[PDB]
Design a protein around this ligand. Sequence first.
Ligand SMILES: O=c1nc[nH]c2scc(-c3cccs3)c12
Ligand SMILES: [Cl-]
Length: 192
Amino acid sequence: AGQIQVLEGLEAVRKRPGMYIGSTSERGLHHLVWEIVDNSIDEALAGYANQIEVVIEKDNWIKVTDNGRGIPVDIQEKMGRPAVEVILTSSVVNALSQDLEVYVHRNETIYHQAYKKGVPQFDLKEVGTTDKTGTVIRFKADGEIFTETTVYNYETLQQRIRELAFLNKGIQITLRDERDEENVREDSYHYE
Ligand SMILES: O=c1nc[nH]c2scc(-c3cccs3)c12
Ligand SMILES: [Cl-]
């Protein structure tokens, strides 16, 4: 019933995405970033993270990285699935992404899962080891949903990232554009 409710939720989001994110215009595209960044900001506010990095990658993938605890990976009571999978298959961003990947650094282990339109492509796996903790989310917005544009605007991202860093003092928030490998731009914000 839990996994069935998962699937019904992804169907709902993709049927009326503007009810979830405001619009499917350029403003809704950028909203995807804000939803992921806000989760990392909560982790900083909780006392566990202090660095967030937003990267516009080739082909308008977005990568958000924080140094928090790592999304948990323990098997749940409710779903019988790893906690990170439950969290990400209930995420609006995941539903509205043609592809999304997570890497969790936790328990000295690197865990990976990938999804398409919110559907896990394989079970969460251990892919490597680590001496850090935190979370990496990489997504590509689904052009079937975002029919006007899937191209991010650096200055739109920059203006809100700067605002977030100013509002959440002590969090280092970095924006980087890698879409043109020949001219990479980066702004990094860290108040007080
Ligand atoms: O730490 C996080 N970074 C990004 N997204 C999420 S969603 C849930 C969490 C965490 C909950 C508890 C530890 S990490 C995070
Ligand atoms: Cl865990």
